[PDB]
Coordinates of C-alpha atoms in Angstrom, one line a residue:
Chain A
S1 CA 0.0 0.0 0.0
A2 CA 3.1 2.1 -0.2
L3 CA 2.1 1.7 -3.8
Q4 CA -0.9 4.0 -3.4
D5 CA 1.2 6.3 -1.2
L6 CA 3.8 6.9 -3.8
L7 CA 1.2 7.6 -6.5
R8 CA -0.4 10.3 -4.5
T9 CA 2.8 12.3 -4.4
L10 CA 2.4 13.0 -8.1
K11 CA 1.5 16.7 -8.7
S12 CA 1.0 16.4 -12.4
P13 CA -2.3 14.9 -13.8
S14 CA -2.1 11.3 -15.1
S15 CA -4.3 8.9 -17.0
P16 CA -5.5 5.5 -15.7
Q17 CA -3.1 3.9 -18.2
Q18 CA -0.1 5.9 -17.0
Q19 CA -0.9 5.1 -13.3
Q20 CA -1.1 1.4 -14.0
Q21 CA 2.2 1.5 -15.9
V22 CA 3.9 3.3 -13.1
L23 CA 2.4 0.7 -10.7
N24 CA 3.6 -2.2 -12.7
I25 CA 7.2 -0.9 -12.7
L26 CA 7.0 -0.3 -9.0
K27 CA 5.5 -3.6 -8.0
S28 CA 8.0 -5.4 -10.2
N29 CA 11.0 -3.5 -8.9
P30 CA 11.2 -3.7 -5.1
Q31 CA 14.7 -2.3 -5.0
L32 CA 13.3 0.8 -6.6
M33 CA 10.4 0.9 -4.2
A34 CA 12.8 0.7 -1.2
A35 CA 14.7 3.6 -2.7
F36 CA 11.6 5.7 -2.7
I37 CA 10.7 4.6 0.8
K38 CA 14.3 5.3 2.0
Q39 CA 14.1 8.8 0.4
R40 CA 11.1 9.5 2.7
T41 CA 12.9 8.1 5.7
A42 CA 16.4 9.5 5.4
Chain B
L11 CA 0.1 -8.7 -23.1
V12 CA -0.5 -8.0 -19.4
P13 CA -2.4 -4.8 -18.9
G14 CA 0.0 -2.0 -18.0
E15 CA 3.0 -3.5 -19.7
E16 CA 2.4 -1.4 -22.8
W17 CA 3.5 2.3 -22.5
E18 CA 1.7 5.6 -22.8
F19 CA 3.7 7.9 -25.1
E20 CA 3.6 11.7 -25.3
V21 CA 4.5 12.5 -28.9
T22 CA 5.7 16.0 -29.8
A23 CA 6.7 17.0 -33.3
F24 CA 8.9 19.9 -34.3
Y25 CA 9.1 21.4 -37.8
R26 CA 12.2 23.5 -38.0
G27 CA 12.3 23.9 -34.2
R28 CA 8.7 24.9 -33.8
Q29 CA 6.3 22.6 -32.0
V30 CA 3.4 21.8 -34.3
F31 CA 1.9 18.7 -32.8
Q32 CA 1.5 17.1 -29.4
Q33 CA -0.6 14.1 -28.4
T34 CA -0.6 11.5 -25.6
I35 CA -1.3 7.9 -26.8
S36 CA -1.5 4.6 -24.9
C37 CA -2.1 1.4 -26.8
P38 CA -0.7 -2.2 -26.6
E39 CA 0.3 -2.2 -30.3
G40 CA 2.6 0.8 -29.9
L41 CA 2.9 3.7 -32.3
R42 CA 3.5 4.5 -36.0
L43 CA 4.6 8.0 -36.9
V44 CA 3.1 8.6 -40.4
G45 CA 2.5 11.7 -42.5
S46 CA -0.5 10.8 -44.6
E47 CA -3.8 9.0 -44.9
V48 CA -4.6 5.8 -43.0
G49 CA -6.6 3.6 -45.5
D50 CA -3.8 1.1 -45.1
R51 CA -4.2 -0.5 -41.7
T52 CA -2.4 -3.6 -42.9
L53 CA 0.3 -2.7 -40.5
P54 CA 0.1 -3.0 -36.7
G55 CA 0.5 0.0 -34.3
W56 CA -1.6 3.1 -33.8
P57 CA -0.9 5.5 -36.7
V58 CA 0.1 9.0 -35.4
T59 CA -0.4 11.4 -38.3
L60 CA 2.0 14.2 -38.3
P61 CA 0.3 17.5 -39.3
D62 CA 0.7 19.3 -42.6
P63 CA 3.2 22.2 -42.2
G64 CA 0.8 24.6 -43.9
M65 CA -1.2 24.7 -40.7
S66 CA 1.5 26.4 -38.7
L67 CA 4.3 27.6 -41.0
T68 CA 4.7 30.4 -43.5
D69 CA 8.1 29.7 -44.9
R70 CA 7.3 28.2 -48.3
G71 CA 10.7 26.5 -48.7
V72 CA 10.5 24.7 -45.3
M73 CA 6.9 23.8 -45.9
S74 CA 7.8 22.2 -49.2
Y75 CA 10.6 20.1 -47.8
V76 CA 8.8 19.1 -44.6
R77 CA 5.9 17.9 -46.8
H78 CA 8.3 15.8 -48.8
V79 CA 9.9 13.8 -45.9
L80 CA 6.4 13.5 -44.4
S81 CA 5.1 12.0 -47.6
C82 CA 8.1 9.6 -47.7
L83 CA 7.4 8.3 -44.2
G84 CA 5.5 5.4 -45.8
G85 CA 4.7 2.8 -43.2
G86 CA 6.2 5.2 -40.7
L87 CA 8.4 5.1 -37.6
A88 CA 7.2 2.2 -35.4
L89 CA 7.7 2.3 -31.7
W90 CA 6.5 -0.2 -29.1
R91 CA 7.5 -2.0 -25.9
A92 CA 8.5 -5.7 -25.6
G93 CA 10.0 -7.0 -22.4
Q94 CA 12.4 -4.5 -20.8
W95 CA 13.1 -2.8 -24.1
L96 CA 11.7 -0.1 -26.3
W97 CA 11.8 -1.2 -30.0
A98 CA 11.9 1.0 -33.1
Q99 CA 11.7 0.3 -36.8
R100 CA 11.8 2.4 -40.0
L101 CA 9.1 1.2 -42.4
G102 CA 9.4 3.9 -45.0
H103 CA 12.0 5.6 -47.1
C104 CA 13.2 8.3 -44.6
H105 CA 16.4 7.5 -42.8
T106 CA 15.8 8.1 -39.1
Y107 CA 18.4 8.6 -36.4
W108 CA 17.6 8.5 -32.7
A109 CA 19.1 9.5 -29.3
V110 CA 18.0 9.2 -25.7
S111 CA 18.5 12.5 -24.0
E112 CA 17.1 15.4 -22.0
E113 CA 13.3 16.2 -22.2
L114 CA 13.8 19.7 -23.5
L115 CA 16.8 19.3 -25.8
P116 CA 18.1 16.5 -28.1
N117 CA 21.5 18.0 -27.6
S118 CA 24.7 18.1 -29.7
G119 CA 27.2 17.1 -30.6
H120 CA 27.6 13.8 -28.7
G121 CA 26.2 12.2 -31.9
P122 CA 23.1 10.0 -32.4
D123 CA 22.9 6.7 -30.5
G124 CA 22.3 5.0 -33.8
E125 CA 20.0 4.7 -36.8
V126 CA 16.6 3.1 -36.7
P127 CA 16.9 -0.2 -38.6
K128 CA 14.6 -1.1 -41.5
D129 CA 14.6 -4.8 -42.2
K130 CA 14.6 -5.9 -38.5
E131 CA 13.5 -4.0 -35.4
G132 CA 16.1 -2.5 -33.1
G133 CA 16.2 -1.8 -29.4
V134 CA 16.3 1.9 -28.6
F135 CA 15.7 2.1 -24.9
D136 CA 16.5 -0.2 -22.0
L137 CA 14.4 0.1 -18.8
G138 CA 17.2 -1.7 -16.9
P139 CA 19.8 1.1 -16.8
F140 CA 17.0 3.7 -16.3
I141 CA 15.9 2.2 -13.0
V142 CA 19.4 1.7 -11.8
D143 CA 20.2 5.4 -12.5
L144 CA 16.9 6.4 -11.0
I145 CA 17.8 4.7 -7.7
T146 CA 21.2 6.4 -7.5
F147 CA 19.4 9.7 -8.4
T148 CA 17.2 9.1 -5.4
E149 CA 20.4 8.6 -3.4
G150 CA 21.7 12.0 -4.4
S151 CA 23.9 11.4 -7.4
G152 CA 22.5 14.6 -8.9
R153 CA 22.2 12.8 -12.3
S154 CA 18.7 12.4 -13.5
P155 CA 18.0 9.4 -15.8
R156 CA 17.2 10.0 -19.5
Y157 CA 13.9 8.7 -20.9
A158 CA 13.2 11.1 -23.7
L159 CA 13.6 9.5 -27.2
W160 CA 14.3 12.0 -30.0
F161 CA 14.0 11.1 -33.6
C162 CA 15.6 13.0 -36.5
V163 CA 13.6 12.2 -39.7
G164 CA 14.9 12.6 -43.2
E165 CA 18.2 14.2 -42.3
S166 CA 21.5 13.4 -40.6
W167 CA 21.5 13.8 -36.9
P168 CA 22.2 17.4 -36.1
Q169 CA 25.7 17.4 -34.6
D170 CA 27.2 20.9 -34.0
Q171 CA 24.3 22.3 -36.0
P172 CA 21.4 23.4 -33.9
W173 CA 18.5 20.9 -33.9
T174 CA 16.1 23.7 -34.9
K175 CA 17.7 23.5 -38.4
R176 CA 16.2 20.1 -38.9
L177 CA 13.0 19.9 -40.9
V178 CA 11.4 17.2 -38.8
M179 CA 12.3 16.4 -35.2
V180 CA 10.1 14.2 -33.0
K181 CA 10.1 13.7 -29.2
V182 CA 8.6 10.6 -27.7
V183 CA 8.2 10.3 -23.9
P184 CA 7.1 7.3 -22.0
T185 CA 4.9 9.2 -19.5
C186 CA 5.3 6.5 -16.9
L187 CA 9.0 7.1 -16.8
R188 CA 8.5 10.9 -16.6
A189 CA 6.3 10.3 -13.6
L190 CA 8.9 8.1 -12.0
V191 CA 11.6 10.7 -12.1
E192 CA 9.1 13.3 -10.9
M193 CA 8.5 11.0 -7.9
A194 CA 12.2 11.2 -7.2
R195 CA 12.1 15.0 -7.5
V196 CA 9.2 15.2 -5.1
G197 CA 11.1 12.9 -2.8
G198 CA 13.9 15.4 -2.7
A199 CA 16.2 14.6 -5.5
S200 CA 17.7 17.5 -7.4
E201 CA 19.5 17.8 -10.8
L202 CA 21.1 21.1 -9.8
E203 CA 24.9 21.1 -10.5
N204 CA 27.2 22.1 -7.6
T205 CA 29.0 24.3 -10.1
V206 CA 26.3 26.9 -10.1
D207 CA 27.8 30.4 -9.7
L208 CA 25.1 33.0 -9.0
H209 CA 26.1 36.4 -10.5
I210 CA 24.4 38.5 -7.9
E211 CA 25.7 41.7 -6.2
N212 CA 27.0 41.0 -2.8
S213 CA 28.8 44.2 -2.0
Chain C
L11 CA 8.2 60.5 -24.1
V12 CA 4.9 60.5 -26.0
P13 CA 5.0 59.6 -29.6
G14 CA 5.0 56.3 -31.6
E15 CA 7.8 54.5 -29.7
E16 CA 5.6 52.1 -27.9
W17 CA 6.5 48.5 -28.8
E18 CA 4.4 45.5 -27.8
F19 CA 6.5 42.7 -26.4
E20 CA 6.0 39.0 -25.9
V21 CA 7.7 38.0 -22.8
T22 CA 8.5 34.3 -22.3
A23 CA 10.4 33.1 -19.2
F24 CA 12.1 29.7 -18.8
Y25 CA 13.1 28.2 -15.5
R26 CA 15.7 25.5 -16.3
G27 CA 14.8 25.6 -19.9
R28 CA 11.1 25.0 -19.2
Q29 CA 8.5 27.7 -20.1
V30 CA 6.7 28.9 -17.0
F31 CA 5.4 32.2 -18.2
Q32 CA 4.2 34.0 -21.3
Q33 CA 2.4 37.3 -21.8
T34 CA 2.0 39.8 -24.6
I35 CA 2.3 43.4 -23.3
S36 CA 2.1 46.8 -25.0
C37 CA 3.2 49.7 -22.7
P38 CA 4.4 53.2 -23.6
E39 CA 6.7 53.1 -20.6
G40 CA 8.2 49.8 -21.5
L41 CA 8.6 46.8 -19.2
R42 CA 10.3 45.9 -15.9
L43 CA 10.8 42.2 -15.4
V44 CA 10.4 41.7 -11.6
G45 CA 10.0 38.8 -9.3
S46 CA 7.9 40.0 -6.3
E47 CA 5.2 42.3 -5.0
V48 CA 4.6 45.6 -6.9
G49 CA 4.1 48.1 -4.2
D50 CA 7.1 49.9 -5.6
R51 CA 5.2 51.5 -8.5
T52 CA 7.2 54.7 -8.0
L53 CA 9.2 53.3 -10.9
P54 CA 8.2 53.7 -14.6
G55 CA 7.6 50.7 -16.8
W56 CA 4.9 48.0 -16.6
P57 CA 6.1 45.5 -13.9
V58 CA 6.1 42.0 -15.2
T59 CA 6.1 39.6 -12.3
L60 CA 8.0 36.3 -13.0
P61 CA 6.1 33.4 -11.4
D62 CA 7.1 31.5 -8.3
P63 CA 8.8 28.2 -9.5
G64 CA 6.5 26.3 -7.1
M65 CA 3.7 26.7 -9.7
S66 CA 5.5 24.6 -12.3
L67 CA 8.6 22.7 -10.9
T68 CA 9.2 19.8 -8.6
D69 CA 13.0 20.0 -8.3
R70 CA 13.5 21.5 -4.8
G71 CA 17.1 22.6 -5.5
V72 CA 16.1 24.4 -8.7
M73 CA 13.1 25.9 -6.9
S74 CA 15.3 27.3 -4.2
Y75 CA 17.8 29.0 -6.5
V76 CA 15.2 30.4 -8.9
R77 CA 13.3 31.9 -5.9
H78 CA 16.6 33.5 -4.7
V79 CA 17.4 35.0 -8.1
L80 CA 13.8 36.3 -8.4
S81 CA 14.2 37.8 -5.0
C82 CA 17.3 39.8 -6.0
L83 CA 15.7 41.3 -9.1
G84 CA 14.6 44.3 -7.0
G85 CA 13.7 47.1 -9.4
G86 CA 14.0 44.5 -12.1
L87 CA 15.3 44.4 -15.7
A88 CA 14.0 47.4 -17.6
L89 CA 13.3 47.4 -21.3
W90 CA 11.9 50.2 -23.5
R91 CA 12.2 51.9 -26.9
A92 CA 13.6 55.3 -27.7
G93 CA 14.5 56.2 -31.3
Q94 CA 15.9 53.4 -33.4
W95 CA 17.1 51.5 -30.3
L96 CA 16.0 49.1 -27.6
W97 CA 17.2 50.1 -24.2
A98 CA 17.9 47.9 -21.2
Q99 CA 19.0 48.7 -17.7
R100 CA 19.6 46.4 -14.7
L101 CA 18.0 48.0 -11.6
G102 CA 18.5 45.2 -9.1
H103 CA 21.2 43.0 -7.8
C104 CA 21.0 40.3 -10.5
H105 CA 23.7 40.5 -13.2
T106 CA 22.0 40.1 -16.6
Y107 CA 23.6 39.2 -19.9
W108 CA 21.8 39.6 -23.2
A109 CA 22.0 38.5 -26.8
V110 CA 20.0 39.0 -30.1
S111 CA 19.3 35.5 -31.4
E112 CA 16.8 33.1 -32.9
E113 CA 13.3 32.9 -31.6
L114 CA 13.7 29.3 -30.4
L115 CA 17.4 29.0 -29.4
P116 CA 19.5 31.6 -27.6
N117 CA 22.4 29.6 -29.0
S118 CA 26.1 29.1 -28.1
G119 CA 28.9 29.8 -28.2
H120 CA 29.1 33.0 -30.2
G121 CA 29.1 34.5 -26.7
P122 CA 26.7 37.1 -25.1
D123 CA 26.4 40.4 -27.0
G124 CA 27.1 42.1 -23.7
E125 CA 26.0 42.7 -20.1
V126 CA 23.0 45.0 -19.3
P127 CA 24.4 48.1 -17.6
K128 CA 23.2 49.2 -14.1
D129 CA 24.3 52.8 -13.6
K130 CA 23.0 53.9 -17.0
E131 CA 20.9 52.5 -19.9
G132 CA 22.5 50.6 -22.8
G133 CA 21.3 49.9 -26.3
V134 CA 20.6 46.2 -26.9
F135 CA 19.0 46.3 -30.3
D136 CA 19.3 48.7 -33.3
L137 CA 16.4 48.8 -35.7
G138 CA 18.6 50.0 -38.5
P139 CA 20.6 46.8 -39.3
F140 CA 17.4 44.8 -38.8
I141 CA 15.6 46.6 -41.6
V142 CA 18.7 46.4 -43.9
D143 CA 18.9 42.7 -43.3
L144 CA 15.1 42.4 -43.7
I145 CA 15.2 44.0 -47.1
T146 CA 18.0 41.7 -48.2
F147 CA 16.1 38.7 -46.8
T148 CA 13.2 39.7 -49.1
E149 CA 15.7 39.9 -52.0
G150 CA 16.5 36.2 -52.0
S151 CA 19.1 35.7 -49.3
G152 CA 18.6 32.9 -46.7
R153 CA 19.5 35.1 -43.8
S154 CA 16.5 36.1 -41.7
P155 CA 17.0 39.1 -39.4
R156 CA 17.1 38.4 -35.7
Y157 CA 14.7 40.2 -33.4
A158 CA 14.5 38.0 -30.3
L159 CA 16.3 39.3 -27.2
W160 CA 17.4 36.7 -24.7
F161 CA 18.3 37.5 -21.1
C162 CA 20.3 35.3 -18.8
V163 CA 19.6 36.4 -15.2
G164 CA 21.8 35.8 -12.1
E165 CA 24.2 33.6 -14.0
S166 CA 26.8 34.0 -16.7
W167 CA 25.8 33.6 -20.3
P168 CA 25.4 29.9 -21.2
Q169 CA 28.4 29.9 -23.5
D170 CA 29.1 26.1 -23.6
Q171 CA 26.5 24.4 -21.5
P172 CA 23.0 24.1 -22.9
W173 CA 20.9 27.1 -22.0
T174 CA 18.4 24.8 -20.4
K175 CA 20.8 24.5 -17.5
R176 CA 20.4 28.2 -16.6
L177 CA 18.0 28.9 -13.7
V178 CA 16.3 32.0 -15.2
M179 CA 16.2 32.7 -19.0
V180 CA 13.9 35.3 -20.5
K181 CA 13.0 35.8 -24.2
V182 CA 11.5 39.1 -25.3
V183 CA 10.2 39.6 -28.8
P184 CA 9.0 42.9 -30.3
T185 CA 5.8 41.5 -31.9
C186 CA 5.9 44.2 -34.7
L187 CA 9.4 42.9 -35.7
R188 CA 8.1 39.3 -35.7
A189 CA 5.2 40.4 -38.0
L190 CA 7.5 42.1 -40.4
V191 CA 9.7 39.0 -40.9
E192 CA 6.5 37.0 -41.3
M193 CA 5.4 39.3 -44.1
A194 CA 8.7 38.5 -45.8
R195 CA 8.1 34.7 -45.5
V196 CA 4.5 35.2 -46.9
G197 CA 6.1 37.4 -49.6
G198 CA 8.2 34.4 -50.6
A199 CA 11.4 34.7 -48.5
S200 CA 12.8 31.4 -47.1
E201 CA 15.4 30.6 -44.4
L202 CA 16.0 27.2 -45.9
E203 CA 19.8 26.6 -46.5
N204 CA 21.0 25.3 -49.8
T205 CA 23.1 22.9 -47.8
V206 CA 20.0 20.8 -46.9
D207 CA 20.9 17.2 -47.6
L208 CA 17.8 14.9 -47.4
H209 CA 18.5 11.3 -46.2
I210 CA 15.8 9.5 -48.2
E211 CA 16.1 6.1 -49.9
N212 CA 15.8 6.2 -53.7
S213 CA 15.4 2.5 -54.4
Chain D
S1 CA -4.0 51.5 -49.0
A2 CA -0.7 50.0 -50.1
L3 CA 0.3 49.7 -46.4
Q4 CA -3.1 48.3 -45.7
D5 CA -2.5 45.7 -48.4
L6 CA 0.7 44.5 -46.6
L7 CA -1.1 44.2 -43.3
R8 CA -3.7 41.9 -44.8
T9 CA -0.9 39.5 -45.8
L10 CA -0.5 38.4 -42.2
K11 CA -1.6 34.9 -41.1
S12 CA -1.3 35.5 -37.4
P13 CA -3.8 37.5 -35.4
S14 CA -2.6 40.8 -34.0
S15 CA -3.5 43.5 -31.5
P16 CA -4.3 47.1 -32.7
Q17 CA -1.1 48.1 -31.0
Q18 CA 1.1 45.6 -33.0
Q19 CA -0.6 46.5 -36.2
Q20 CA 0.0 50.2 -35.6
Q21 CA 3.6 49.6 -34.7
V22 CA 4.1 47.8 -38.0
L23 CA 2.5 50.6 -39.8
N24 CA 4.8 53.1 -38.1
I25 CA 7.9 51.3 -39.2
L26 CA 6.5 51.1 -42.8
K27 CA 5.7 54.9 -42.9
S28 CA 9.2 55.6 -41.6
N29 CA 11.0 53.3 -44.0
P30 CA 9.9 53.8 -47.7
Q31 CA 12.8 51.7 -48.9
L32 CA 11.3 48.8 -46.8
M33 CA 7.9 49.4 -48.4
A34 CA 9.6 49.2 -51.8
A35 CA 11.3 45.9 -50.8
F36 CA 7.9 44.3 -50.1
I37 CA 6.3 45.7 -53.3
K38 CA 9.1 44.4 -55.4
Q39 CA 8.9 41.1 -53.7
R40 CA 5.3 40.5 -54.8
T41 CA 5.7 41.6 -58.5
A42 CA 9.0 41.0 -60.3

């Protein structure tokens, strides 16, 4: 659910397609996800 | 085939430097940059028709030449995703050279990354190095990962010469990659060089 | 300070190469590019407030430096017409370099035409050579006269690096000059070089 | 009227200000006016 959390930090408008494509890259690249989480917690 | 694996592309076209077209497209078959009618859907990929230069230009010489390379696009410039790679192919008669670079500038002269193949498809972008560079960007490397694909159509890639001299330049941006880098910026990553010397009176 | 020396200007500002502001303004007193509140209207010239980078950007580092530069604009960069010349004067703390260039690319590295003076005004565009070049442009030359003034603010002129790396760039176009050159193109003049070499298959 | 003819040959829309400023440069530069006339004929 850090998924949904990262998405909401987007200022710019996005399409359902774009969101799903961002989501798929995130949920398939945990090392990238941790990087974003670490950015919020460091 | 899995929903979300295909990529949404923002396609922006530049005739002689001037932006003349912009459209955001998302479909599983990818894109085909064409310059004419679409009564020939024998080819796969969503046909993106580049506009006639008469709609936005007044230079007759440029309009004539731009019309020519557009008409010679034939099947067009194909671009789609398969696996971790972005694939491109030149289906017409216009030699097309590409480079991955900055969103706002195709830049010169570090030369084109290569020429878009005709007979077989060629890989033009790898998601692999992108993500790796995005992570180190998040970790404060200061170097933002490139995701903008620029295509020079009908002419040699503009080295040393300004890209605005080219008749037909096209930018294609995977919007999901743009959003990822923005996520890093919002997270606190910056591209600002530490060599910035502000010229402001201090005395 | 009353006759026909009012020039309408299109002002376009770019933060880190990205367009964040555009307005077309015709004022007999000319313009003052500022970056804050306008309670200082004791100064002549229409005050053009450059926008806070929070409205458009996500890069925090860039946002900080742009905000600081805009802060130091003070009385601002002044621009007005008197006689055959365009006059500029730097009223604040931000060093400002200028060049007459293309409409789309401030270009490099032929260097900046100069630095906008502070203690006194300085001419940054002479209408004379423009009209001479315009006439020859209509007579079949390929050289279109330049009328776009570019201003680099708070940093040195981008002489090697891409101009998109500069924190605050501003383009100012006298719309009447733009229209004149357009009349030439409509008249039949073209900027297309004879060195154009199309890369199109012939088999 | 000759000046008015040149103004008509303008694709882009324009403010009354812009148009007047163009006319002022035309009235002040007869050699420029000649340049445009010679361009559309011979």
